[PDB]
Amino acid sequence: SSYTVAGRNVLRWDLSPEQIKTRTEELIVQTKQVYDAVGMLGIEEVTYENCLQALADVEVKYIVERTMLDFPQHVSSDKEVRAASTEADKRLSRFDIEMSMRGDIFERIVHLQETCDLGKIKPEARRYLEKSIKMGKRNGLHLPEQVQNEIKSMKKRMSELCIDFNKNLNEDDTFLVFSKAELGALPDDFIDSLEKTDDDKYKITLKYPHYFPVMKKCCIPETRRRMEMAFNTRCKEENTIILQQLLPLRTKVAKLLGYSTHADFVLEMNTAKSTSRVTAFLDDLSQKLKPLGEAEREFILNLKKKECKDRGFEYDGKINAWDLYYYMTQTEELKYSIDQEFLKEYFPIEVVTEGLLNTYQELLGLSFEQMTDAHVWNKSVTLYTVKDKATGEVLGQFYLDLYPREGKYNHAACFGLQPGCLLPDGSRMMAVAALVVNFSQPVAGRPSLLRHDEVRTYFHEFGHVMHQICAQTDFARFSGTNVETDFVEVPSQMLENWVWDVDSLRRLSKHYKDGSPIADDLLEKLVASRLVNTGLLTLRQIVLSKVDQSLHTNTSLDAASEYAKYCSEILGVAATPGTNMPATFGHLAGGYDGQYYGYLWSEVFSMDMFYSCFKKEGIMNPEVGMKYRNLILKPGGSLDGMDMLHNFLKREPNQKAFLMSRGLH
């Protein structure tokens, strides 16, 4: 039922490695029979019920059953389950290609669109037709025979290379051993939480709760250099081989389909349309950030010469790759009076979560409640039930995996587990999401305290959770976050602005020992810090965007030398010789290939929707929040990205609100 919750979450997390392999073969057969039934009937026998409805009913069933088989490889504690899920992901991905390269299924969908009154079906039904044909031509189904077999062969290999790429980063275990003297300036709550070796030294892992506190606080230059070295060389050998094959395969398949480069192939399905507009967006943006880059690079260098003068270290006169995070922290302390290790005392994990949910149990008109003794994949996971406040409709559920562990996803992303589309019986399926992050853990008898950037990530990933739950469509391929990948970061980055409001932070803040809020003048200092180090922070994001474009537009280039090229040309900090950053760039194998510009591209839209609608009429106003939930989150992929922006802004977006929020023209 649309108002109950019992029986709507069909996901089981107690699968064994044998059960995972068994279900993979069963899901392939039971889906092969559906595609064979549609592909076997005559072309003159196709209808909306036996062709379009038959495929639509199997896509929703497949993607839900697929979730239980390709998600344990990201959150499980058993490496055999993580191995069985990774092998099941490689098998189901090749099955997706064999079912998409069908000439029989393609010949009937194109004939169905012609011999059918399009004005009689719902507008999303005909969009399902034109997008299926568009997705078929992007597979070369209108090309001659042996050309399709060569495309299908290279797509299968690209599938296995991308899965092995992230599998290497997920299963990495390289650590470093440091002594107490080599971990200078690090607080004692961080050092007393490390595994101690036989030589009375400490062990440091490369996860975020360990790498960042070392690169921001440790005053020993040799410690920060060896940490940055091991972090930017993870899987340097095995992934460079994968990159030397994945990139040429994308070029050969993009030109077989008629496109110039692989960047041009993926850009026409995004809001930016063309690659010439992306390079113009990145070059003109780094043009305005260039004066800010020179000013911030000069202050950091002067900040380094004085510390080397005081501590007695040798001064090389350059800003190395390991000196960046260390002195950007000092710029935040000196120019804005912000102590990250003291600010986290007012942000315990439960107070942030309680305030984060209450912020959206009022803005979006939702009703959150936690489930007790929920069926989860790990004891650290909690389940919540999302309900509409007025109608009581059970919209969906979401999990919370907030702590790092062995074999867990190293970064911080959101996973859409169940879509919010229609079932074959006509009922609406309850949507399920999952927030996976690696926040700090409770140490020294204190609750899990979060830095302000950890709260910014908490609000960011929760945007994808809300975009997943509130999305209600009819087809599975248009539900959830299935929008333009350069537009999917609009709902997430839109909610980061609530971490920069003084009244919103006052609700998210409570000291972990006496419950006293943050000082009034200190809230002003924290809000005023939203543009500290904005030059170098954004320039480094432009470098990643240019490398993402360069590796997919120009052929025959070393990814390591191309990343180092754009470093000294844009950011100003030289890449350490030997460190292969693209070998660790997980976005190049996680659907963000050739589309990494979408982060800065989506920020122009979120800033325009926040300053022109939310901030103008109160950021907590539910009338504006209801427009945002119905025109941005609810349509999902059933509408175009620019269509949802024109319906919400009632005009055309621009960089007006985006530029003045960064301190530019």
Binding site: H411, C414, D453, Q541, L544, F585, H587, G590
Partner: peptide, 6 residues
Amino acid sequence: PGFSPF
């Protein structure tokens, strides 16, 4: 989904 590499 996903997030920029910090």
